[PDB]
Paper text:
After screening several PilB constructs, we found that PilB from G. metallireducens (PilBGm) formed crystals that diffracted anisotropically to 3.4 Å in one dimension and 3.9 Å in the other two dimensions. The structure of PilB was solved by molecular replacement using GspE as the search model, and we were able to build residues 181–568 in each chain. Three chains could be built in the asymmetric unit, and an elongated hexamer was identified in the crystal packing. There is anomalous signal in the predicted tetra-cysteine zinc-binding sites, so zinc was also modelled into these motifs in each chain. In four sites, ADP and magnesium best fit the electron density, even though no exogenous nucleotide was added during crystallization. These nucleotides must have been pulled down from the cytoplasm of E. coli during purification. Herein this structure will be referred to as PilB:ADP. In PilB:ADP, ADP is bound between two packing units. One packing unit, packing unit 1, binds ADP via the Walker A motif with magnesium coordinated by E357 of the ASP box. The PilB:ADP structure also contains an apo interface between two packing units, where no nucleotide is present.
Author numbering:
A (entry chain C): 181 to 260, 268 to 568
B (entry chain D), D (entry chain D): 181 to 263, 267 to 475, 477 to 568
C (entry chain B): 181 to 262, 267 to 568
The structure:
C-alpha cells in the first residue's frame, strides 16, 4: 500500500522541519498531523480519515508493538533518527505521538546555550567544586537536560567516575554510565542513589528529586565529598531553597551542602533574515523592565516572517538563565528563616540577574522579541 | 434470550413515547414497568415475574454495575445506539426485588458560553485568569449534577487552540469536542485515571484534563503533572474550597505539594431560579435576612418568590442559576497550608482576603432577584 | 572457561598495581576496566564484550550473590587466595552491569601517626586530645581523605586490657582483636543513635561513632563527652573551624560546643612525588607568594614535578600523603564561641594562634619535596 | 552442662571480687571476660571460644531476652540467689559475636524519705496534695534510671496505711514493702499489666500501682480504674508533662478520658550534683545565663563547678539531684484537651499558670549551688 510512503513522509518532513514532536490525532470528523516547532504546535497535514487505522498500525510495526489491541495505551521506541513512540486510545481512533531525540544536534557547548558571560562563569565555577550540589530548575522542556548534559559533557575524563540515574535516559554517552530506572520493580531515585555511594563515584547525576527520601540521600551525597547534579520543578530559582525546607530538609544542610541553583526557561529566537525594529513605548518597557538608564539604547525587533521562518517570524530558541550560586549572605538568610521575597531581594541586590532581567537583556541584544519576554518569563515584583 | 430484545423494546418504546422517566420496580404480587409522560406516570408493562431477576440483572450489566452486591444501591449511566442515546440508571434494593430507574439525559441545548454561566464578575476574573498559566492545577468541586463538567468545558472551550495539545480523560465524555483529545475509560479493560495520566505525560501535553481524582494513585501523578510545567483540570465532590484542601491532605498528599501545585479551587452548586413571569416580591424580616448579609444593605433587599403558571408546572421556579465560590491560591493561603492548617482557619483567611463564599454569592443573586431565600437556604450552609 | 583466569587477572593485577578501586563498566560500544590509583582513575583494560555477561556473572558467584536478577543492584564481600578480601557493588547500567570492587587491605593498615604526614607539632596536639579522660576529638574531611585511617590508628594507639572501647561503624572496614566492633545495619532498626544508646549502657571508657549526621546523634554524643568518656567521631565540613559552626547550626548550644570538645582536626590527601624520577620545577616567586606563601623564604623554595618513569607507570606520582590542620581549643577560641563569633572570626583567631591551615600544612610538605606544587594547589583551598 | 556452672562461676567470682562491672565480649581472635574493680578494668578469663555462643545465649535466657533476634541490642535484668542478688544486663550485637555486659544494682541505701528527694517546695505541695484523692491517676515520666520508681515509692510509703488496700504490679519489684501487695509479672506465663489490672478491680483495691503503661490494652483499663473511684500510679518514658498527654492521645485514648482521669503528670530527670568540697565559683556571662532565666535576677547567679578530688575520682561532681516538673491538671488545662490541644500550647498554658518547668527547676538548683550550668544544659531542653 502507499501508506508506507506516507508514514515515512511524516517522519521525514518532521526532521526537515526541525520539529521536536510529531502528533497524529484522529478525530470524529477530522484527521490531522501536527508538528511542534520551537515549542509551539502547527498543523502540517490532513491525511485522509479512511487510512487512520493503516497509518497508525504501521508505526506500531516499526516500534515492534502489538497492533491487535486498540483499547489501551502502548509505548516504545523507533530507530531509523530515533523516536520515542506513545500511543493513546482516543474515542475516534488511536493518537500517536513521536518525540524525536536528536543525537547530532545536541549542543554540548555552554557558550552556545545563550548563557550570559557572568552567569556562565558562576555555573562553570560551581560545577568544578568537588563536594557540592548543582540544581537545574524549570518546567518540562525548559532545557534542563540539555544544560545538564553539557555540564556532564564539560567534565568527563578518564580520571573520574561519573554515574547517572535518569528517568528516562535521553541520550547515550560513551564514558558515562547511565542507569534507567522504572519504579514498578522497585528502582527509585533514592535506591539508585544509595547504590551509587557504594560504587566510589566522583560525579553523580539524578534527574529530579520529588521525595524527601531521595532529597536526604542526595544532600548527604553532597556532604560526603561528591558533586551531585539534579533538578527541581519550581516557580523561580529562590523558591527551590524554601521548597527544600518544606521537603523537611534542615536549613543548615540546604545552606551548607548545595553550591548552586539555576532557573531557566526557553523563548523563541527572532529570525535573522526578517527582523525589523518595532517601536515599543519606553514606558511599557520600564513598567516591567529596567528603569530608563537603558531606555534610549533599546532597539526591539520582530520578524515579519519569510520562507526561512515558515512565516512564523521566529527561527530557533534561546535560553533565559538565572544562575544563583550560594552566597555567604544567602546561607545566612536560609539559616535565619528568611522568606522567598527577601531571598530574591538580596540576590538581585548582590548582582545576580533574574529571568525576566536576563531575558530583557537578550531583547536589547536583538536575540528575542518583547512579546516572547512577556509570554515566557513571569513578572517580577 | 428473548428478554434481551424485550429489555431493549421497553427503552425503544419509551423513546417513541414522550416519557422522560422509566421504572421497572419489582413486587411480589405483580410487576410494574412504568413510564412518566409530561410528569404524569403510567403503568405500561406487566412482564414475566420469572424473568424479573433475569431482566433486572441484565440492565445492571449494561451500566457497568457490579451484580455481586444486590443488597446496596448502585448508580451509573449507559449509552444506546441511535441515529446517539444516553441514560442514567439508579438501582435500589427492594425487599422483594431490585428496582431500576432510568432517567433520560439530554446532552444538547447546553452550550459553552462562559459569560452566561453566571460566574460573578470578580469570580470570573479569578477563574479565567487562573485557567491560563503554564504552571498550575485547577479543581472544580460540587455534588453530581452541579454542572461541574459544563463549567470545565467552558474553560476548555476558551483554552482550546490550534497551538496547544489539550487532552481529556473522562468516564463518560459528556460532550464531544472537535480538536480536543478525548479518552473514555472503562476500568474492566484497565483504562484508568492513573493509567491515562501516565499515558498523557509521554505525549507532550500542554493541558491535561481528568474528570475527578478519587484516590491517591491518580492524585499523585496528577499533581506531578501540574509541577511538570502543565495545566491540570479536575473535579472533586466536597463541601467547599477549603474542604477540598483537607481531603487532599487526608489522601496523603504532602502539605507543600498541595500549596505548590493547585492554583485554584472553585466550588459551585446549581439552584432553581425563580420564574420570570411568576416572581412577586415577598417581604421577609430584614433581621433574619440580615442574619444570613450586611446589616447596612439589609433594608434594600427585596427577594422574589414565584407562585406558579403553565410554564413552570406550578413549581414556582424556572431555570438553574449556580452559586459560585472561587478561591485562587494566595500567598497568604499558601503560607497557611505550610505552617499547618485547619479547614475553618482556611475559610476565615480566604473570606477576609476578599474571596466571596457560596452564601454571599447566593445572596447577591437574591438581591438581584434571580433566586429566593428558600432556595439559598436549601443549597448553602451558613458561613456565620 | 578463560573467564575464571581473566577475572582473577583483573583482581591480581589490581593488587600488584596498588589500586584503591576496581571498576568493570560495560558500554554500548566499548568495554572497559578501570583502576583507581592514588585517588586518580586510570583505565588498565579493554576486555571483549562477548565475555561481558560472563565476566559480571562469575563475580556474582564469587560474592555469593544472586545471578537471577540482572535488573537490580547487588552488594557483598569476597575473600580469595593467591589472601585478599574486598567488597563488591553491582549496578544495572543500561548496556550491562557495572561492578565496582573497593579494596580493603587486611595487613596494610598504617597504624603509625608520624607515617601519615602529621606535622610534628600537630601530632603532639592530636595525641594530647586522644589521651585525655573526657571529651571529644573530631577529625573532618571528605570521603577518601583518610579519616578512617586516622581513627583506626588512634584506637590502635591507645588500646589496653584495662579499658572497654566501643565503636559504631557503617561499615566496619577492619576487624581488630581487643576492640569490640559492631557493624551497623539501619534497615533492621539499628541507627547511630540506637547503637550509641546501647554504648552508654555497656559502661565504656572510650566510644567511637563513625559520623554524626544529625542532632539526635549529636546530642547523645555530646552528653557522653560530658559524662567522662572520650568520644571519637567525624563531621563533613570544609575545614576545622567550620566544624564548630556546623555543630551550632545543628542546634547544639554554644556552651556545650566549647566545654565538651577537646580538639578538632581536618585533613585531606594529595598525591606523592616519585622516589626516582622527581625533579625540580620552576614556580615564579610572585605567583607562589600571592597564594602559596607569605613573602619570606619564598625564594628558597624547591618545587618538584615528576617526569614519570617505569616505577610510576609514567604518572609522575607514587602514593599520597595527608595535609592536616589539628586545632585544640585555647581559651581565646572558647571565649569567642561563648560570645557568638562567626566562622571568619574563629578562623582569624585559630590562624592567629599556633594552628596551621591546610594550605600551610601542604606548603611545608612542598618544601620537603614530598608533594608537588600542582597537588598543593589542586586539593586544599586558599585561605585568603 | 559444665558451661552453666562456669557461667555462674564468673558471676560468683565477680561477687568475691570488688568489681562493679563484668564484660563477656566476644572476639574472633580471642575471648575477653573482664571485671572492673575500683573503676579500673582487668581481663579475668580466656574461656572456650567453642562455648562462646553457647554461654552468651545462656545468659540471655536468664534475662528473659529473646534469643530469636541476635542482630539487635537487648536490655534487661536478672536476680541471683544469695544469703538476694540482682544484675542489669546489656546485650549488643558484635560483628564476631554478641557482647553481654552485667552491671551490679545496689537496691539498698536508697530510702523513701520524701523531704530529701529534692522536690521544690511548691512542687512537693502539688505532688503530695495530688497523691491523696479518692479519684484520680498520677503519672511520673522520665528516662530509665531517673529515679521514677524511688519517687513513686516515696508517695507510696506516705500513702501506705493499715486502713486501705494498696497493691502494686511491677516487673521486677525494685524494693520489698511490708503490707503492700506486690505482684511481679513475667509475660511468659501470661502475667501482664492488663491482666494484673483486671485482677485488681475484683479485689476491692483502694490504691492501684502499676509500673508503666506501654500500650492501649493496659491504658484503657488503667484509666477505667481511675474513674472507678480508685487511685492510679504509673510511669511513662516521655519528654515532658505535656508530651505525656500527646502520647496518651496517640495511644487512642479519648480526649475527655485523659482530662477526666489523670489529675497529675510529673516529669523528672537525675543530674550529677557538684562536689561539696571541690565546688568553686565559676563566672559565666550573665547574658548567656540570662538567655536560659529572669534578666532581673541574672546578676545574682553564681554557679559552682567542681574540679576533682579523691572522693569524686576527679569527676567534678558527687551525688544526684533531680530536676522536677510537676503538672497538676488545672481546669484551664482541662478545657484545652477537650477543645483540642497541641503539645506546645499545653506547655504554654501550664507555664503561664505558674507551673514551673524542668529548666527553671534546674536553674533554681543552679542558683542555690547544687548543680552547674554544664549539667543543666545536658539534661534539660531549652524552654525558650
Ligand atoms: N540554548 C538553547 N539553544 C537552542 N536550543 C535549545 C537551547 N536550550 C534548549 N533548547 C532546545 O529545547 C529542548 C529542551 O528540552 P529538554 O532540555 O530535553 O527538556 P527538559 O530539560 O525538561 O528535559 C531541546 O530539544 C533543545 O533542542
Ligand atoms: N596518610 C595516608 N597515607 C597513605 N594512605 C592514606 C593516608 N590517608 C588515607 N590513605 C588511603 O585512604 C584510604 C582510606 O580512606 P578512609 O580513611 O576510608 O577515608 P574516609 O575516612 O573519608 O572514609 C586507604 O586505602 C589509604 O590507602
Ligand atoms: Mg528531562
Ligand atoms: Mg569512613
Ligand atoms: Zn523570516
Ligand atoms: Zn411560574
Ligand atoms: Zn616516576
Ligand atoms: Zn571533688
Amino acid at each position: 500500500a502507499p501508506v508506507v510512503k506516507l508514514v515515512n513522509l511524516i517522519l521525514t518532513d518532521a526532521i526537515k522541519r526541525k520539529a521536536s514532536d510529531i502528533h497524529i490525532e484522529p478525530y470524529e470528523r477530522s484527521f490531522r498531523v501536527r508538528y511542534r516547532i520551537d515549542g509551539v504546535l502547527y498543523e502540517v497535514m490532513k491525511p485522509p480519515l479512511k487510512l487512520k487505522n493503516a497509518i497508525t498500525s504501521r508505526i506500531k510495526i516499526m516500534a515492534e508493538l502489538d497492533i491487535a489491541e486498540r483499547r489501551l495505551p502502548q509505548d516504545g521506541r523507533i530507530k531509523i533518527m530515533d523516536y520515542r513512540v506513545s500511543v493513546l486510545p482516543t474515542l475516534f481512533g488511536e493518537k500517536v505521538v513521536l518525540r524525536l531525540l536528536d543525537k547530532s544536534n545536541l549542543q554540548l557547548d555552554m557558550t552556545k546555550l545563550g548563557y550570559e558571560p557572568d552567569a556562565l562563569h558562576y555555573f562553570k565555577e560551581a560545577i568544578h567544586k568537588p563536594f557540592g550540589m548543582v540544581l537545574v530548575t524549570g518546567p518540562t522542556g525548559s532545557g534542563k537536560t540539555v544544560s545538564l548534559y553539557s555540564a556532564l559533557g564539560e567534565l568527563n575524563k578518564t580520571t573520574e567516575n561519573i554515574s547517572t540515574a535518569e528517568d528516562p535516559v535521553e541520550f547515550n554517552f560513551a564514558g558515562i554510565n547511565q542507569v534507567q530506572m522504572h519504579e514498578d520493580i522497585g528502582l527509585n531515585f533514592a535506591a539508585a542513589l544509595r547504590s551509587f555511594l557504594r560504587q566510589d563515584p566522583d560525579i553523580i547525576m539524578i534527574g529530579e528529586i520529588r521525595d524527601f527520601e531521595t532529597a536526604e540521600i542526595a544532600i548527604k551525597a553532597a556532604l560526603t565529598g561528591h558533586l551531585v547534579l539534579s533538578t527541581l520543578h519550581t516557580n523561580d530559582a529562590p523558591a527551590t531553597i524554601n521548597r527544600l525546607l518544606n521537603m523537611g530538609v534542615e536549613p543548615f544542610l540546604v545552606a551548607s551542602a548545595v553550591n548552586l541553583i539555576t532557573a531557566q526557561r526557553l523563548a523563541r529566537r527572532v529570525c535573522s533574515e526578517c527582523k525589523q525594529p518595532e517601536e515599543i513605548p519606553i514606558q511599557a518597557l520600564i513598567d516591567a523592565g529596567v528603569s530608563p538608564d537603558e531606555g534610549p539604547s533599546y532597539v526591539c525587533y520582530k520578524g515579519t516572517g519569510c520562507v526561512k521562518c515558515n512565516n512564523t517570524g521566529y527561527k530557533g530558541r534561546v535560553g533565559f538563565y538565572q544562575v544563583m550560586p550560594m552566597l555567604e549572605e544567602i546561607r545566612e538568610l536560609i539559616l535565619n528563616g528568611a522568606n522567598t521575597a527577601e531571598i530574591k531581594r538580596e540576590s538581585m541586590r548582590l548582582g545576580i540577574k533574574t529571568m525576566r532581567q536576563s531575558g530583557l537583556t537578550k531583547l536589547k541584544e536583538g536575540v528575542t522579541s518583547f512579546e516572547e519576554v512577556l509570554r515566557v518569563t513571569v513578572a517580577d515584583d
